Amino acid sequence: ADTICIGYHANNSTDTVDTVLEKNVTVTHSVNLLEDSHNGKLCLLKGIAPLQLGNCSVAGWILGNPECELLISKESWSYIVETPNPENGTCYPGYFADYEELREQLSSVSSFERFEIFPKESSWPNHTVTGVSASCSHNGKSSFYRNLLWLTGKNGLYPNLSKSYANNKEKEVLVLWGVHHPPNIGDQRALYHTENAYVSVVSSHYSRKFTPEIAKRPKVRDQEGRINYYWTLLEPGDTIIFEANGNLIAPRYAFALSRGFGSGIITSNAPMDECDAKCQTPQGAINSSLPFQNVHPVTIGECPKYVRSAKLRMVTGLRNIPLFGAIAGFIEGGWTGMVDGWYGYHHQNEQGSGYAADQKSTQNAINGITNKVNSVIEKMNTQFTAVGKEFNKLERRMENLNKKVDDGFLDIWTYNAELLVLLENERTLDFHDSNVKNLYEKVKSQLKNNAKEIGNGCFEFYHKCNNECMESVKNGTYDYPKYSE
Amino acid sequence: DTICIGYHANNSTDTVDTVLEKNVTVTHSVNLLEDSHNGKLCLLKGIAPLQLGNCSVAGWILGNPECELLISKESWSYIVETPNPENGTCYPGYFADYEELREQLSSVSSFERFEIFPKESSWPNHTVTGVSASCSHNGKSSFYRNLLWLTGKNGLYPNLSKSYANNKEKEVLVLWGVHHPPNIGDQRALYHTENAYVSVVSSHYSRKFTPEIAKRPKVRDQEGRINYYWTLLEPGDTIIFEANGNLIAPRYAFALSRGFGSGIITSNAPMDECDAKCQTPQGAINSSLPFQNVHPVTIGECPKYVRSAKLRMVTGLRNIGLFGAIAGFIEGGWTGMVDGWYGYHHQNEQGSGYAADQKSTQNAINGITNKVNSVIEKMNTQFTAVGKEFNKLERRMENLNKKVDDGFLDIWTYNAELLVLLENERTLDFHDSNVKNLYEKVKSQLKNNAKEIGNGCFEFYHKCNNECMESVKNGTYDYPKYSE
Amino acid sequence: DTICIGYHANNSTDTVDTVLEKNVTVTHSVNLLEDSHNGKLCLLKGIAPLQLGNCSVAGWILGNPECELLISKESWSYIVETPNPENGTCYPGYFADYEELREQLSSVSSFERFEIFPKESSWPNHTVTGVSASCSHNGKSSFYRNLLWLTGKNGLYPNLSKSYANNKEKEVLVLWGVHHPPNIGDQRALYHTENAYVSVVSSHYSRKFTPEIAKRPKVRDQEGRINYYWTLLEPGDTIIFEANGNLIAPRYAFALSRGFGSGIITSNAPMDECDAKCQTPQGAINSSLPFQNVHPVTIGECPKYVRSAKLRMVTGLRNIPSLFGAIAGFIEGGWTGMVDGWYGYHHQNEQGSGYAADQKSTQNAINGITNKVNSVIEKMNTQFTAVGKEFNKLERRMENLNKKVDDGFLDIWTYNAELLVLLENERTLDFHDSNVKNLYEKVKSQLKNNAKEIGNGCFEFYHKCNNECMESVKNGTYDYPKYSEE
């Protein structure tokens, strides 16, 4: 009356997965491949602290806005952090030429050095160096940019200035200057004493002649006139020449920059933190190496591909609910006592149900599913892509093209990831069912006609099979001629 | 008394492709590709489109005299134009950021055309009576409706210092022009100042135009030119026009209540009131299916475009390999058994019968329905802004966009076909699984009370009446009852 | 006596990767990744490419004196440029929209260089003898062959009004230059006009250039500049040049007819006369394979570049020398002698040789796997690819966007393909594990209880079965009552 049954394992469950054919399927074990949390703090990126700007923008920090003195000491950074609505920067009204391009240049810079390209006293001995305005007020007092100097006429004369600088820093030198546009002709005749002024910025690769434009303009920050801002990158071994007779905001401090590639500027009000993380988002930082995430499309660093999914769970064990042939077939029950493995046997000579587990098939299935999951996670490589671009009001076609690229990538990744989850969950369930079916077939082949097939995955022995005989059956060392006669 | 296990067959001629086999006839199939369009420029979303007819966008905004039928159009869901519009820019000139302006105007829910500068009061000394034969309407020479040609009066052109403030709480499109004469004689006769200038300045825009006088080839029977410029005055902003000549003044500006993400279609199809969720130059597409092959550029709720001609998914069995069930021991499809997918044949007192086991059939239907519905539903449509326009100097852009779309088209066309093939095979491998298991179940119940014929049929040793057959079908076959 | 079922095995060391297992040795496999280039710049679409040699594109079109070997060109499919553009813009200056001109000159079906304004006849009131050491040739000062330097004559620089009509009925590329002297004295000595202007006007182009005198750093031992501008006169359009000085006039224009959009390849590899459909900077590749890892930048109908180093798909069984419970089940190892097919039987009793090969199952499996591989290869159809893009210093953002377009695509194709070749491989192996197993069952039901099931994939006939009845068994016919008792 001895019986040996073959079955699988079930536990407390409470974890669900989705397959191609069925939804809300409950499984013994599963793995999450979707990151859905962030620390809420702007950690360091690969050991390089971000350049926080606070109440200032990139234009103000580079130009030297008076109210931006809390961040003068900056040497190395990987990305630039901005508040959602910077309040300081371009205190004097004007237009920043190629501003977004300069921001992209400055997002990735090493060994940032601020150096006086033209000394305040030596460079301009014949000009009124001092120049201030109420728009760029500092501590309740009128002031001007720290890195620029408002040259004005001295002794009723503006001598023709011709100042040349050679790049001796063996790097690329960002040089910034400005051109002043008074709102009234008399203001020009007083500041520069020349109605027809000119500005000429010349390099081996740069050449531009700015001509002052005098007209009545709406008041911005209580100033009708406008200072236009321009910038250039002087290459090593190159010389830049400024030649002017008026309306020139002369450079004072230039910046030596090490070449950087591929970083972006994050705009968020979340706090900065001492932590170091390998992937940054505006709202937080993600430490997990899961293939996909559902936090924010704009990511900096080697980040998981963004998806529009809320659940991506992959099956790693048998279905916890008690197709192929074995599970939901001639064996529609789950041995909750199978705490040693996935596939096992049963004893009735002296033991009960759910006592031993066949570690061979269990180990084979474990290795197969582990390789499947590891391949799915690992096949994605590092990106280090600063997804997210900035375009002005005259570049809306650029904005829409970038939006289309990001949206297409998002849609492809979401669709493919969800499909793979469904198909591989179904295939994993089928794989477990095939493994247990093969185990039952092996037991049947070993027993031959010395046992009766009950129908519920059990065999009733035609002889007395003591515990050691059961060990022989499970070990594969069953001796049919021993009990044949 | 014999019980035979079999599957379903019918007269279906539907054909699918699998990974291992091609041109496979199946009992049932589902289409995932939409290839039919109504051929009508139907309504999109909830608003009707705007058709420019013979006119272009430039002629519409600037006020070409032949586009007088387009003045009353206040709101639109999307813009459609004839393939090669002729009206627009009647006076030769250069429209600065014209493609950019088209992109801005496409995503506009509604607009109000208002007289930014009244024709009489704004310019008292300046003569406002200026027309040309290049812009001719009803024989008489004419000029733009929303622009005005300023010329000197009594041999004098006083300096103009006009300004306007945005009180509409919406962005205001302002259009103006700068006239470049062919010869200095026209410059000194129409403006009386040989060296003129124009300055348009706001809180975010500032540009100075100096007239350029040179001999130019005749376009629309005209040597002189008029360069057109535009700006989008933000709410709470003021625009200033200051000039001593060669200024084409704005006469009508447009308060734009802007939308988001709309485009312009170059189509010649007639319009219809379909309220369709999708739109293409040729016609409209049903968004129910996940893939379409009608037109690459699409606007609205349009499915993903693919470069494939057939994407058919199996939702049934093979009409008339793995698990060895279909084309194995069972090699015939039961055309009579139309009740379900799998079943048995009656015998004994029952002369015949083609019963269909509803358990496995309903389970398979649920599974395959979930598969197909997952394939269709997992696809999201969102909104399509496919297509861009680039000028002659943005060729590098035109290729890059061409790289994008084609690239995506190379992915979706490939994967989908794989998805159609890879799953179809499995679908078939699903069906032959179920019946096989079903057979095994019967083979388990009868034990030695029946002999295995070999063709999916069991010959009962004992007499199996209708009640006994129903006992076998339900799985409650009483082995002790019929042991003898 | 006995009949055994088994699968084919050989000594092939070709290994593959599957979802569940890695380093799986298979009897046969197919490579789907191309990693070989001949190192030769084969011509594409049957048209020989244009190799500029040591000349930049600007030097070639402007007519650089050293770039005289590139004058006699008629047609090309793509442009090849050496990594060292030594020759080009010999006189310092700025080339307006140079990247766009390179983009629009990468593919020209018919290229003709015609003297739009003859040197001897167009300018009788001006001196045309303008040369400089910046563009010197054969040891003496020279100038661009396709441009002309106009200066004053008899101490006078009269007004210039020249017009050309597009009678070529093609796209007339016209190049001109504006000279910016370093000193006012040079301007007054060469052009005799301190305030000059150059107006270039057509039906769709109109630009006024004002000379900009300023002290400039010496680049080519020259403190002046010559800014270069160009336009494409449309058919039926007339171009007009009007200038009182500082004009570098056109001498030879080009009647272009643009073709299928292509790019520019930077390569120093030898230009061989092989013919190919795909081109890479390093060489040319297979293109019949759907995937490649030679170079991300490609020209022509090229396979989708992937970041994979091994993309191999199984076409046979697992090579086990001497799921579904087969291959790893009842037959632990496959026969190393059966070479006529993938599945077969073992002769015994009358003929103990053991030769057999079930042709029907083997051929069906071959057809299925061949259809799988052919579908995977063929379903990827790619048209002409021109992924190469060029952007200036002020278009870095654009460049990054292009990179984001490229790398992202590389992230997709790499992830899917490998994953795909991981999945189907396993399936293919499982497919084999189906067939053989089914074959075993087909024998079992055919032999019923006339044979003892040994369990190693064999049936030991209780009766005496000669070669004829064993062949009938392999034919699927076996009279069970005939051999019930023997």
Ligand SMILES: *[C@@H]1O[C@H](CO)[C@@H](O[C@@H]2O[C@H](CO)[C@@H](O[C@@H]3O[C@H](CO)[C@@H](O)[C@H](O)[C@@H]3O)[C@H](O)[C@H]2NC(C)=O)[C@H](O)[C@H]1NC(C)=O
């Ligand atoms: C740096 O950022 C701060 C914060 O935005 C700036 O303070 C702001 O300064 C403006 C004047 O420049 C203030 O506007 C004032 O509003 C009152 C309202 O009654 C009006 O009467 C005044 O005539 C003036 O328009 C604004 O209120 C003030 N905001 C705050 C929060 O302090 C500061 O000016 C910036 N500094 C630089 C150098 O950019």
Ligand SMILES: *[C@@H]1O[C@H](CO)[C@@H](O[C@@H]2O[C@H](CO)[C@@H](O[C@@H]3O[C@H](CO)[C@@H](O)[C@H](O)[C@@H]3O)[C@H](O)[C@H]2NC(C)=O)[C@H](O)[C@H]1NC(C)=O
């Ligand atoms: C994938 O599996 C193959 C074998 O199927 C590996 O090839 C074999 O790798 C061994 C590694 O030491 C090489 O050394 C040989 O080892 C054997 C013992 O296995 C030893 O008897 C020999 O004297 C020799 O030292 C061996 O040459 C090589 N080839 C063969 C035909 O055995 C391969 O390394 C595996 N790859 C991975 C990534 O695991």
Ligand SMILES: *[C@@H]1O[C@H](CO)[C@@H](O[C@@H]2O[C@H](CO)[C@@H](O[C@@H]3O[C@H](CO)[C@@H](O)[C@H](O)[C@@H]3O)[C@H](O)[C@H]2NC(C)=O)[C@H](O)[C@H]1NC(C)=O
């Ligand atoms: C076309 O390209 C050739 C080859 O590059 C140019 O020849 C010039 O060759 C010399 C060596 O013979 C290169 O070295 C330079 O020599 C000068 C003295 O001639 C010396 O002062 C420099 O310091 C340097 O060592 C020289 O770079 C090279 N010139 C250029 C522009 O690359 C030839 O001049 C080129 N012709 C034109 C019209 O661009």
Ligand SMILES: *[C@@H]1O[C@H](CO)[C@@H](O[C@@H]2O[C@H](CO)[C@@H](O)[C@H](O)[C@H]2NC(C)=O)[C@H](O)[C@H]1NC(C)=O
């Ligand atoms: C506007 O386009 C039309 C053709 O689309 C041009 O042709 C005129 O068409 C109208 C009817 O729409 C006729 O009444 C005129 O006689 C046609 N004139 C010519 C010269 O063909 C028309 O010229 C265009 N008008 C403008 C101002 O561009």
Ligand SMILES: *[C@@H]1O[C@H](CO)[C@@H](O[C@@H]2O[C@H](CO)[C@@H](O)[C@H](O)[C@H]2NC(C)=O)[C@H](O)[C@H]1NC(C)=O
């Ligand atoms: C080139 O690509 C083909 C794509 O099918 C690879 O396949 C070969 O195709 C040729 C031509 O049909 C056959 O003669 C070979 O027998 C095929 N070989 C295999 C392994 O399929 C081919 O291998 C590729 N060439 C390489 C990688 O050098």
Ligand SMILES: *[C@@H]1O[C@H](CO)[C@@H](O)[C@H](O)[C@H]1NC(C)=O
């Ligand atoms: C499952 O529930 C039982 C309830 O008795 C509890 O003892 C056991 O610890 C639970 N196991 C898990 C893994 O939650």
Ligand SMILES: *[C@@H]1O[C@H](CO)[C@@H](O)[C@H](O)[C@H]1NC(C)=O
């Ligand atoms: C689906 O699964 C979730 C698991 O969180 C469970 O809360 C919910 O009740 C289930 N619903 C159905 C209909 O099975």
Ligand SMILES: *[C@@H]1O[C@H](CO)[C@@H](O)[C@H](O)[C@H]1NC(C)=O
């Ligand atoms: C300074 O520049 C003005 C404007 O071009 C010019 O008139 C004047 O002669 C110049 N003076 C010197 C000393 O260079």
Ligand SMILES: *[C@@H]1O[C@H](CO)[C@@H](O)[C@H](O)[C@H]1NC(C)=O
């Ligand atoms: C399949 O083959 C039959 C037989 O020639 C043919 O009539 C039918 O059109 C084919 N269908 C397809 C889709 O190729």
Ligand SMILES: *[C@@H]1O[C@H](CO)[C@@H](O)[C@H](O)[C@H]1NC(C)=O
């Ligand atoms: C367009 O032009 C054609 C040709 O002159 C004319 O017949 C037709 O009526 C015009 N349609 C509109 C809408 O202007």
Ligand SMILES: *[C@@H]1O[C@H](CO)[C@@H](O)[C@H](O)[C@H]1NC(C)=O
């Ligand atoms: C108009 O502006 C010009 C600018 O050149 C100036 O010369 C002229 O005096 C102005 N008109 C009057 C009436 O002042």
Ligand SMILES: *[C@@H]1O[C@H](CO)[C@@H](O)[C@H](O)[C@H]1NC(C)=O
């Ligand atoms: C002409 O009237 C306009 C309208 O304000 C004004 O700008 C201009 O000064 C007037 N001309 C005069 C007063 O000479």
Ligand SMILES: *[C@@H]1O[C@H](CO)[C@@H](O)[C@H](O)[C@H]1NC(C)=O
């Ligand atoms: C391996 O098999 C191939 C194909 O049959 C054969 O050409 C080769 O000689 C074999 N090598 C060895 C060492 O048996």
Ligand SMILES: *[C@@H]1O[C@H](CO)[C@@H](O)[C@H](O)[C@H]1NC(C)=O
């Ligand atoms: C290009 O210049 C290099 C300089 O070393 C020279 O070796 C090579 O022969 C030159 N090639 C041509 C085609 O002029």
Ligand SMILES: *[C@@H]1O[C@H](CO)[C@@H](O)[C@H](O)[C@H]1NC(C)=O
């Ligand atoms: C040359 O052009 C200038 C500027 O356009 C003009 O002032 C002068 O009269 C012209 N001279 C001749 C001879 O055409």
